[PDB]
Nucleic acid binder design. Sequence first.
DNA 1: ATCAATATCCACCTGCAGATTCTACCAAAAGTGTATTTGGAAACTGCTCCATCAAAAGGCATGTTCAGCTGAATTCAGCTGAACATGCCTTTTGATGGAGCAGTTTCCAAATACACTTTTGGTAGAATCTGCAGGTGGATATTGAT
DNA 2: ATCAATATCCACCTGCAGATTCTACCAAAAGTGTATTTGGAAACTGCTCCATCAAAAGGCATGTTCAGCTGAATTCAGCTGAACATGCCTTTTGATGGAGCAGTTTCCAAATACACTTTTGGTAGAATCTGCAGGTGGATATTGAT
Lengths: 104, 104, 80, 78, 91, 93, 95, 94
Amino acid sequence: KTRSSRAGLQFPVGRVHRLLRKGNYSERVGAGAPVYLAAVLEYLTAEILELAGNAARDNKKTRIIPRHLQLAIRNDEELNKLLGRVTIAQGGVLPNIQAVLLPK
Amino acid sequence: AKTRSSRAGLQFPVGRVHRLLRKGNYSERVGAGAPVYLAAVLEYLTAEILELAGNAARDNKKTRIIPRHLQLAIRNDEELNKLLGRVTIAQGGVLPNIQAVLLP
Amino acid sequence: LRDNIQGITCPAIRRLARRGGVKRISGLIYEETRGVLKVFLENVIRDAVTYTEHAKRKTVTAMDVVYALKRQGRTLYGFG
Amino acid sequence: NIQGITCPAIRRLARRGGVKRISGLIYEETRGVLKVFLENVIRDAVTYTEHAKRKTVTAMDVVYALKRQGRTLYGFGG
Amino acid sequence: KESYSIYVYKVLKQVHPDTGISSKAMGIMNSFVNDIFERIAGEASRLAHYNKRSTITSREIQTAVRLLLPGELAKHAVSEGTKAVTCYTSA
Amino acid sequence: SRKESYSIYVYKVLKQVHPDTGISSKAMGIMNSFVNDIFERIAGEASRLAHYNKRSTITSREIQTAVRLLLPGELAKHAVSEGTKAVTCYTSA
Amino acid sequence: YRPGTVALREIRRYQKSTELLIRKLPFQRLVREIAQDFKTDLRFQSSAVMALQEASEAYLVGLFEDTNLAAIHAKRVTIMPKDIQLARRIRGERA
Amino acid sequence: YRPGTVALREIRRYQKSTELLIRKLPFQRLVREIAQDFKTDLRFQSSAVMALQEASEAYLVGLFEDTNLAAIHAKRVTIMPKDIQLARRIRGER
DNA sequence: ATCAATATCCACCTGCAGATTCTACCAAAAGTGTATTTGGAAACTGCTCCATCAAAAGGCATGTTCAGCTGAATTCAGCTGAACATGCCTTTTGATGGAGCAGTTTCCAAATACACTTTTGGTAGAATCTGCAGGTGGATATTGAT
DNA sequence: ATCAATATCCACCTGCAGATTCTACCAAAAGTGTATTTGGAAACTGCTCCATCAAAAGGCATGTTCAGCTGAATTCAGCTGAACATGCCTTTTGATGGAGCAGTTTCCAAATACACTTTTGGTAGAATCTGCAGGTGGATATTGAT
């Protein structure tokens, strides 16, 4: 009967609604707000996780590790633009050698 | 019958600051000390700019401070400039400086 | 309204650059600068307008432009 | 102890950073620079620390400071 | 004592059921969900505060999300946002 | 519509530091969005500090730490000076 | 006057001054045009168009300051598209 | 092997890897040392010294990326202090 | 261009240790259900503020001209950084011990929140004041060719 | 080294448009007195955090040798700045209509505020598995020489 399943999510609408008033973002939270927010986090979450597991699996292995996350974020134009000022610890950088440094 | 600004010897409003503090939702409870302190720090900083500003006004020939005078005052004080490092001052112009190499 | 971007003249650009402390300016600088200026505006306004039509307004206010500018981290005093 | 930062480890960095040929005077520059970077993170962290009345500086403190410098960091807290 | 780790794992097991996740990696995911949480919500609060409403509705989270997510990510984000609010309005 | 502003105060302070001197309109505007920007920086940081250290009340102690966080060098020093002396000269009824 | 010096006392002519340097009108027409790709029938406060002016000009003066440095760095004295392209990738505007 | 190519094969050796490249210890004492100028008797979570490391290095790979562009831009292939100081003023650190 | 010797990887194999996942519990959230409250949505309407338009004026953009000086390309030498191989030492690590302190509870004194009732401080024009924009004219530096 | 050819100042004036001051409410602090949380203030777990030790390891410090690349200086061609006449369109000033911002009232649809009623999520063991570390063996991929 929980409201996450009532909106067909797998992130918690409750825990989110709570975090929302208990942060002081205003004094009153619409009943829609935590639903929606719960959703956007679930969508974005799946988008990274998918690009990630794809990277892991392309790279030999059954599970996603910080390398797979950093790969997934830095190859998608948009996710990378969202996470442009975030460091993924344990993640390394993407391969890039300037054309000029190349032989002959 | 005694005001709280005059109670701390500020001339920024402690009351009105305390209000803004509760009506922003920075939390649910604002200590009686907080708005005092803040009222002061804003009065202080204000005075530091206004000071450098009026100085800029008089050697820049004039009786009142204008955006040019403010922009001068801030971009010449190391600290103020770094506080206001990502702020654009409308109608303030740029500080004068020409690269060494471009000179005759 | 069509292709008004070229109203941004090569002498006004070269005034900017002069304020910018530039002494000698290439030719291809001008439409690069046009590219850049258009891009910049496109971003500010996209946000601005969004702030407008969150307020259910058909008039885009100064304060909206202020807010987008604050979000882009290009904070702006004196209309705010 | 800043000299504990070796020239082969700097050049490992720069190599990951995609550099092919590295001057000599790069090393004392990089040392200067790293020192500065730390000084700012750490100052903010330690401030967060002794606001909590602590004598132990936590990771999360380092996280917060990093978020204030705009160098946000995932995988320890936020 | 809490985290989102459980949920990130549910969703993972939607998009890649055969696939799993390192610990340090799950950590990366969690401080991510909180970074985005905080970003959207803050922007919502500014929007409440600017337009002088003391209540944050799904509408704020929506405008916030069109403000903060770049390009097509905002499009789909807004989609599954409103879809979950509608399929919530029903029950 | 009461258009609230700090202009009275910024002028008071002005006439402390330069009694003979005045200020443009646009200049006064600059001054106001400045006072609000600094207000926000300080207050926000104070509030995050609240949330971090799990206290639901913002005291002067936060405004202080926040101020040492945002103001660089000797400006933070003197800001903390007159913050603390204004609260102490306030406690005395 | 030899090429180089009108440039220089232009530089200081315009640095001591706080006038907007793009003309108010063509500008306003560009703003209006770009906006109309996001919403239509949109009407602008005159001050909004003003702020947009002040901002985008300040941004462009800045980008020119940096670009000036990139050219000076690269043997040169004369600013070119690759320079702006650098300043903007380092600034991480388009990376 | 010709001057130039162990460099390149280093570049891809270290780019595929997510290893911290400063040694954990000397780093740790630099951290502690700098700290000691802000508060005394200070004690660090092992993880804080770690996060500081991930941060500082990540930052340094970044600065090396830009500084690399400043050099490539300036006719060259070999990074120099003028390169780092440009990247730091354009980035607006200085 | 290939040639063959180096050095570098990569693929494919493999047993097992360290994680990760999976399960079993209950304190702790989230959901229910009810009775109040309250914002902000609905619905006029008062009035700025914006969009045109015009008209007259110059203020600037254009286009052109043309020569200098700057960017681009080469040349070249010396010297700096890469590469490599050596011998040593600083780091790594792997538990183990000792203990400084984060982290939790249990209360309450002190601090803050309410809810109205008082008592000004601050805003909006209206009534005054006076720097300053714009205009001039030789003084005062800059700049440039012989 | 100097003037002339120019451009810039700096001083000197004035009526105005724009601060500055004055006035009059009005909405917001301030005052009072119960009505509460809250965050210390002690008292104490259980934990990370130091601090060693001690090997053993690899990672660093050094020095040599030298190729390749960084800078300096040249040369030239073209391209950008300076200069000016042409005439255009942006700018100013004032009027005109009206769109769509704002302000207020009215008052439910929506959210809050508790007190239980259920159920979820987190901790800490319980039960597999995914990589790791290590190993030839085959081409890769360079490298200098016919």
